[PDB]
């Protein structure tokens, strides 16, 4: 039944950049292949006068050589024909941190409690996703109500990502 094609995934209706501004604590995540942020992830979103969205993010990353580093990351977003789908250019303040460009979609959000984000980095020949990442954010570091948890589980299912997220710890590693 349900369609796993990236192109059929619903997104946030009439997304509002200005209401999305602010601090968002990552609560759970579904990792992509390769190096990614491990934990202690906190993102901060901003929208200037011209409507240009940007964000800064802090998170712990395990370098291949076993060092643990706190990554200071920056991302700028470009608008598209869909208010909830953006192209994200990102880079770190330290030269060794990953740089790239990645789609950034806002699956769902109430602006005040939770948000579900999603990025497909590589499409299969059938249109499904072969390499994705998804974050579940909260406005409160204490998490969500059971009521909101139900909604979030729903969205995970529609991303065909159910049963594949892991809880993310916050223990002050990058100053929390
Ligand atoms: C080794 C360093 C690694 C992998 C860093 C990866 C950082 C990455 C995914 C950052 C993504 C985000 C940015 C910039 C802005 C806010 C939201 C996101 C979606 C949190």
PDB file of C-alpha atoms and ligand atoms in Angstrom:
ATOM      1  CA  UNK A   1       0.000   0.000   0.000  1.00  0.00           C
ATOM      2  CA  UNK A   2       1.888   3.017   1.329  1.00  0.00           C
ATOM      3  CA  UNK A   3       4.265   4.655  -1.093  1.00  0.00           C
ATOM      4  CA  UNK A   4       7.951   4.957  -0.203  1.00  0.00           C
ATOM      5  CA  UNK A   5       8.757   7.201  -3.106  1.00  0.00           C
ATOM      6  CA  UNK A   6      10.482  10.371  -1.861  1.00  0.00           C
ATOM      7  CA  UNK A   7       8.397  12.354  -4.294  1.00  0.00           C
ATOM      8  CA  UNK A   8       5.176  11.349  -2.597  1.00  0.00           C
ATOM      9  CA  UNK A   9       6.133  12.279   0.959  1.00  0.00           C
ATOM     10  CA  UNK A  10       3.934  14.999   2.333  1.00  0.00           C
ATOM     11  CA  UNK A  11       5.516  18.102   3.812  1.00  0.00           C
ATOM     12  CA  UNK A  12       4.482  20.957   6.119  1.00  0.00           C
ATOM     13  CA  UNK A  13       1.678  22.951   4.555  1.00  0.00           C
ATOM     14  CA  UNK A  14       2.396  26.620   4.036  1.00  0.00           C
ATOM     15  CA  UNK A  15       5.599  26.495   6.094  1.00  0.00           C
ATOM     16  CA  UNK A  16       6.457  29.667   8.031  1.00  0.00           C
ATOM     17  CA  UNK A  17      10.158  30.435   8.287  1.00  0.00           C
ATOM     18  CA  UNK A  18       9.693  33.096  10.914  1.00  0.00           C
ATOM     19  CA  UNK A  19       7.756  30.855  13.261  1.00  0.00           C
ATOM     20  CA  UNK A  20      10.403  28.161  12.939  1.00  0.00           C
ATOM     21  CA  UNK A  21      13.209  30.463  14.167  1.00  0.00           C
ATOM     22  CA  UNK A  22      14.874  29.652  17.434  1.00  0.00           C
ATOM     23  CA  UNK A  23      16.429  26.835  19.370  1.00  0.00           C
ATOM     24  CA  UNK A  24      15.510  23.257  18.620  1.00  0.00           C
ATOM     25  CA  UNK A  25      16.907  20.322  20.643  1.00  0.00           C
ATOM     26  CA  UNK A  26      17.468  17.147  18.671  1.00  0.00           C
ATOM     27  CA  UNK A  27      15.635  14.317  20.475  1.00  0.00           C
ATOM     28  CA  UNK A  28      15.977  11.371  18.130  1.00  0.00           C
ATOM     29  CA  UNK A  29      17.647  10.685  14.814  1.00  0.00           C
ATOM     30  CA  UNK A  30      17.949   8.204  11.946  1.00  0.00           C
ATOM     31  CA  UNK A  31      21.538   8.290  10.624  1.00  0.00           C
ATOM     32  CA  UNK A  32      22.796   8.309   7.054  1.00  0.00           C
ATOM     33  CA  UNK A  33      25.835   6.391   5.858  1.00  0.00           C
ATOM     34  CA  UNK A  34      29.224   7.711   6.946  1.00  0.00           C
ATOM     35  CA  UNK A  35      30.294  10.365   9.383  1.00  0.00           C
ATOM     36  CA  UNK A  36      27.484  12.251  11.122  1.00  0.00           C
ATOM     37  CA  UNK A  37      26.804  14.137  14.396  1.00  0.00           C
ATOM     38  CA  UNK A  38      26.497  11.690  17.225  1.00  0.00           C
ATOM     39  CA  UNK A  39      24.902  13.445  20.121  1.00  0.00           C
ATOM     40  CA  UNK A  40      24.415  16.598  22.128  1.00  0.00           C
ATOM     41  CA  UNK A  41      22.907  18.175  19.019  1.00  0.00           C
ATOM     42  CA  UNK A  42      21.241  21.600  19.361  1.00  0.00           C
ATOM     43  CA  UNK A  43      20.269  23.722  16.313  1.00  0.00           C
ATOM     44  CA  UNK A  44      19.433  27.399  16.146  1.00  0.00           C
ATOM     45  CA  UNK A  45      17.433  28.821  13.245  1.00  0.00           C
ATOM     46  CA  UNK A  46      17.330  32.412  11.988  1.00  0.00           C
ATOM     47  CA  UNK A  47      15.501  34.311   9.247  1.00  0.00           C
ATOM     48  CA  UNK A  48      16.703  37.732   8.169  1.00  0.00           C
ATOM     49  CA  UNK A  49      14.707  40.719   6.900  1.00  0.00           C
ATOM     50  CA  UNK A  50      14.887  39.412   3.324  1.00  0.00           C
ATOM     51  CA  UNK A  51      13.490  36.035   4.418  1.00  0.00           C
ATOM     52  CA  UNK A  52      16.689  34.185   4.088  1.00  0.00           C
ATOM     53  CA  UNK A  53      16.866  31.276   6.479  1.00  0.00           C
ATOM     54  CA  UNK A  54      20.024  30.172   8.248  1.00  0.00           C
ATOM     55  CA  UNK A  55      20.960  27.956  11.169  1.00  0.00           C
ATOM     56  CA  UNK A  56      23.878  27.118  13.357  1.00  0.00           C
ATOM     57  CA  UNK A  57      24.279  23.711  14.945  1.00  0.00           C
ATOM     58  CA  UNK A  58      26.324  22.204  17.771  1.00  0.00           C
ATOM     59  CA  UNK A  59      26.946  18.486  18.174  1.00  0.00           C
ATOM     60  CA  UNK A  60      29.527  15.917  19.151  1.00  0.00           C
ATOM     61  CA  UNK A  61      31.358  14.078  16.498  1.00  0.00           C
ATOM     62  CA  UNK A  62      33.734  11.117  16.834  1.00  0.00           C
ATOM     63  CA  UNK A  63      36.643  11.605  14.564  1.00  0.00           C
ATOM     64  CA  UNK A  64      37.861   8.516  12.743  1.00  0.00           C
ATOM     65  CA  UNK A  65      40.966   8.614  14.970  1.00  0.00           C
ATOM     66  CA  UNK A  66      38.888   8.347  18.122  1.00  0.00           C
ATOM     67  CA  UNK A  67      38.930  11.986  19.198  1.00  0.00           C
ATOM     68  CA  UNK A  68      35.663  13.419  20.233  1.00  0.00           C
ATOM     69  CA  UNK A  69      35.109  16.968  19.036  1.00  0.00           C
ATOM     70  CA  UNK A  70      32.339  19.446  19.390  1.00  0.00           C
ATOM     71  CA  UNK A  71      31.355  20.517  15.888  1.00  0.00           C
ATOM     72  CA  UNK A  72      30.327  24.093  15.253  1.00  0.00           C
ATOM     73  CA  UNK A  73      28.287  23.993  12.065  1.00  0.00           C
ATOM     74  CA  UNK A  74      26.688  26.590   9.821  1.00  0.00           C
ATOM     75  CA  UNK A  75      23.983  26.121   7.142  1.00  0.00           C
ATOM     76  CA  UNK A  76      22.257  28.559   4.760  1.00  0.00           C
ATOM     77  CA  UNK A  77      18.980  27.581   3.109  1.00  0.00           C
ATOM     78  CA  UNK A  78      17.719  28.350  -0.409  1.00  0.00           C
ATOM     79  CA  UNK A  79      13.909  28.458  -1.034  1.00  0.00           C
ATOM     80  CA  UNK A  80      12.225  26.257  -3.705  1.00  0.00           C
ATOM     81  CA  UNK A  81       8.700  26.029  -5.245  1.00  0.00           C
ATOM     82  CA  UNK A  82       7.688  24.291  -2.069  1.00  0.00           C
ATOM     83  CA  UNK A  83       7.744  26.370   1.102  1.00  0.00           C
ATOM     84  CA  UNK A  84       8.775  23.367   3.207  1.00  0.00           C
ATOM     85  CA  UNK A  85      11.556  22.005   0.994  1.00  0.00           C
ATOM     86  CA  UNK A  86      14.997  23.658   0.985  1.00  0.00           C
ATOM     87  CA  UNK A  87      18.495  23.209  -0.454  1.00  0.00           C
ATOM     88  CA  UNK A  88      21.043  23.462   2.461  1.00  0.00           C
ATOM     89  CA  UNK A  89      24.671  24.544   2.006  1.00  0.00           C
ATOM     90  CA  UNK A  90      26.632  23.695   5.145  1.00  0.00           C
ATOM     91  CA  UNK A  91      30.133  23.897   6.569  1.00  0.00           C
ATOM     92  CA  UNK A  92      31.963  23.867   9.838  1.00  0.00           C
ATOM     93  CA  UNK A  93      33.919  26.615  11.607  1.00  0.00           C
ATOM     94  CA  UNK A  94      36.851  24.135  11.718  1.00  0.00           C
ATOM     95  CA  UNK A  95      38.203  23.169   8.313  1.00  0.00           C
ATOM     96  CA  UNK A  96      38.172  19.459   9.008  1.00  0.00           C
ATOM     97  CA  UNK A  97      34.379  19.280   9.377  1.00  0.00           C
ATOM     98  CA  UNK A  98      32.155  18.021   6.551  1.00  0.00           C
ATOM     99  CA  UNK A  99      30.972  20.405   3.901  1.00  0.00           C
ATOM    100  CA  UNK A 100      28.207  19.675   1.465  1.00  0.00           C
ATOM    101  CA  UNK A 101      24.831  20.546   0.120  1.00  0.00           C
ATOM    102  CA  UNK A 102      21.754  18.621   1.149  1.00  0.00           C
ATOM    103  CA  UNK A 103      18.012  18.809   0.621  1.00  0.00           C
ATOM    104  CA  UNK A 104      16.294  19.787   3.868  1.00  0.00           C
ATOM    105  CA  UNK A 105      12.576  19.101   4.187  1.00  0.00           C
ATOM    106  CA  UNK A 106      10.272  20.005   7.051  1.00  0.00           C
ATOM    107  CA  UNK A 107       7.981  17.064   7.366  1.00  0.00           C
ATOM    108  CA  UNK A 108       5.868  18.308  10.194  1.00  0.00           C
ATOM    109  CA  UNK A 109       5.915  20.924  12.868  1.00  0.00           C
ATOM    110  CA  UNK A 110       3.649  22.794  15.230  1.00  0.00           C
ATOM    111  CA  UNK A 111       6.355  25.428  15.692  1.00  0.00           C
ATOM    112  CA  UNK A 112       5.898  25.257  19.443  1.00  0.00           C
ATOM    113  CA  UNK A 113       6.601  21.658  20.448  1.00  0.00           C
ATOM    114  CA  UNK A 114       8.077  19.394  17.764  1.00  0.00           C
ATOM    115  CA  UNK A 115       9.449  19.165  14.204  1.00  0.00           C
ATOM    116  CA  UNK A 116      10.350  16.260  11.944  1.00  0.00           C
ATOM    117  CA  UNK A 117      13.072  16.938   9.371  1.00  0.00           C
ATOM    118  CA  UNK A 118      14.189  14.779   6.483  1.00  0.00           C
ATOM    119  CA  UNK A 119      16.900  14.500   3.807  1.00  0.00           C
ATOM    120  CA  UNK A 120      17.382  11.950   1.112  1.00  0.00           C
ATOM    121  CA  UNK A 121      21.020  12.120  -0.106  1.00  0.00           C
ATOM    122  CA  UNK A 122      20.696   9.488  -2.772  1.00  0.00           C
ATOM    123  CA  UNK A 123      17.757   8.233  -4.725  1.00  0.00           C
ATOM    124  CA  UNK A 124      17.346   4.599  -5.812  1.00  0.00           C
ATOM    125  CA  UNK A 125      16.433   3.824  -9.387  1.00  0.00           C
ATOM    126  CA  UNK A 126      12.831   3.221  -8.184  1.00  0.00           C
ATOM    127  CA  UNK A 127      12.458   6.571  -6.577  1.00  0.00           C
ATOM    128  CA  UNK A 128      12.750   5.427  -2.968  1.00  0.00           C
ATOM    129  CA  UNK A 129      15.579   6.688  -0.767  1.00  0.00           C
ATOM    130  CA  UNK A 130      18.902   4.813  -0.601  1.00  0.00           C
ATOM    131  CA  UNK A 131      20.636   7.144   1.833  1.00  0.00           C
ATOM    132  CA  UNK A 132      18.618   9.287   4.250  1.00  0.00           C
ATOM    133  CA  UNK A 133      18.757  11.117   7.567  1.00  0.00           C
ATOM    134  CA  UNK A 134      15.964  12.423   9.738  1.00  0.00           C
ATOM    135  CA  UNK A 135      15.833  14.378  12.987  1.00  0.00           C
ATOM    136  CA  UNK A 136      13.085  14.769  15.420  1.00  0.00           C
ATOM    137  CA  UNK A 137      13.431  18.071  17.272  1.00  0.00           C
ATOM    138  CA  UNK A 138      11.706  19.482  20.340  1.00  0.00           C
ATOM    139  CA  UNK A 139      11.471  22.957  21.704  1.00  0.00           C
ATOM    140  CA  UNK A 140      11.843  21.720  25.262  1.00  0.00           C
ATOM    141  CA  UNK A 141      14.870  19.670  26.251  1.00  0.00           C
ATOM    142  CA  UNK A 142      12.506  17.552  28.324  1.00  0.00           C
ATOM    143  CA  UNK A 143      10.780  16.148  25.270  1.00  0.00           C
ATOM    144  CA  UNK A 144       7.100  15.824  24.229  1.00  0.00           C
ATOM    145  CA  UNK A 145       3.800  14.690  25.611  1.00  0.00           C
ATOM    146  CA  UNK A 146       2.453  11.228  24.755  1.00  0.00           C
ATOM    147  CA  UNK A 147       0.003  13.070  22.575  1.00  0.00           C
ATOM    148  CA  UNK A 148       2.746  14.473  20.411  1.00  0.00           C
ATOM    149  CA  UNK A 149       4.662  11.231  20.462  1.00  0.00           C
ATOM    150  CA  UNK A 150       1.801   9.615  18.637  1.00  0.00           C
ATOM    151  CA  UNK A 151       1.885  12.236  15.926  1.00  0.00           C
ATOM    152  CA  UNK A 152       5.674  11.897  15.525  1.00  0.00           C
ATOM    153  CA  UNK A 153       5.435   8.083  15.256  1.00  0.00           C
ATOM    154  CA  UNK A 154       2.930   8.627  12.516  1.00  0.00           C
ATOM    155  CA  UNK A 155       5.229  10.815  10.481  1.00  0.00           C
ATOM    156  CA  UNK A 156       8.083   8.372  10.890  1.00  0.00           C
ATOM    157  CA  UNK A 157       5.869   5.706   9.360  1.00  0.00           C
ATOM    158  CA  UNK A 158       5.000   7.904   6.445  1.00  0.00           C
ATOM    159  CA  UNK A 159       8.724   8.450   5.824  1.00  0.00           C
ATOM    160  CA  UNK A 160       9.041   4.737   5.801  1.00  0.00           C
ATOM    161  CA  UNK A 161      11.558   5.148   8.545  1.00  0.00           C
ATOM    162  CA  UNK A 162       9.593   3.543  11.428  1.00  0.00           C
ATOM    163  CA  UNK A 163      11.568   1.515  13.943  1.00  0.00           C
ATOM    164  CA  UNK A 164      14.805   3.131  12.730  1.00  0.00           C
ATOM    165  CA  UNK A 165      15.459   6.136  14.936  1.00  0.00           C
ATOM    166  CA  UNK A 166      17.595   6.262  18.059  1.00  0.00           C
ATOM    167  CA  UNK A 167      17.278   8.523  21.122  1.00  0.00           C
ATOM    168  CA  UNK A 168      19.992  11.245  21.388  1.00  0.00           C
ATOM    169  CA  UNK A 169      21.637  12.081  24.659  1.00  0.00           C
ATOM    170  CA  UNK A 170      22.354  15.578  25.951  1.00  0.00           C
ATOM    171  CA  UNK A 171      24.946  15.584  28.655  1.00  0.00           C
ATOM    172  CA  UNK A 172      26.577  18.976  28.226  1.00  0.00           C
ATOM    173  CA  UNK A 173      29.460  17.692  26.129  1.00  0.00           C
ATOM    174  CA  UNK A 174      29.465  20.734  23.883  1.00  0.00           C
ATOM    175  CA  UNK A 175      28.341  22.892  26.779  1.00  0.00           C
ATOM    176  CA  UNK A 176      24.789  21.998  27.554  1.00  0.00           C
TER     177      UNK A 176
HETATM  178  C1  LIG B   1      31.639  15.710  10.801  1.00  0.00           C
HETATM  179  C2  LIG B   1      30.661  16.776  10.908  1.00  0.00           C
HETATM  180  C3  LIG B   1      29.403  16.303  10.482  1.00  0.00           C
HETATM  181  C4  LIG B   1      28.794  15.136   9.760  1.00  0.00           C
HETATM  182  C5  LIG B   1      28.442  17.408  10.600  1.00  0.00           C
HETATM  183  C6  LIG B   1      27.219  17.176  10.069  1.00  0.00           C
HETATM  184  C7  LIG B   1      26.446  18.378  10.364  1.00  0.00           C
HETATM  185  C8  LIG B   1      24.967  18.372   9.723  1.00  0.00           C
HETATM  186  C9  LIG B   1      24.268  17.292   9.238  1.00  0.00           C
HETATM  187  C10 LIG B   1      24.290  19.495  10.082  1.00  0.00           C
HETATM  188  C11 LIG B   1      23.014  19.721   9.781  1.00  0.00           C
HETATM  189  C12 LIG B   1      22.159  20.899  10.245  1.00  0.00           C
HETATM  190  C13 LIG B   1      22.521  22.277  10.063  1.00  0.00           C
HETATM  191  C14 LIG B   1      23.909  22.838   9.533  1.00  0.00           C
HETATM  192  C15 LIG B   1      21.627  23.433  10.492  1.00  0.00           C
HETATM  193  C16 LIG B   1      20.560  23.016  11.302  1.00  0.00           C
HETATM  194  C17 LIG B   1      19.872  21.793  11.072  1.00  0.00           C
HETATM  195  C18 LIG B   1      20.726  20.578  10.786  1.00  0.00           C
HETATM  196  C19 LIG B   1      19.838  19.535   9.728  1.00  0.00           C
HETATM  197  C20 LIG B   1      20.988  20.044  12.090  1.00  0.00           C
END
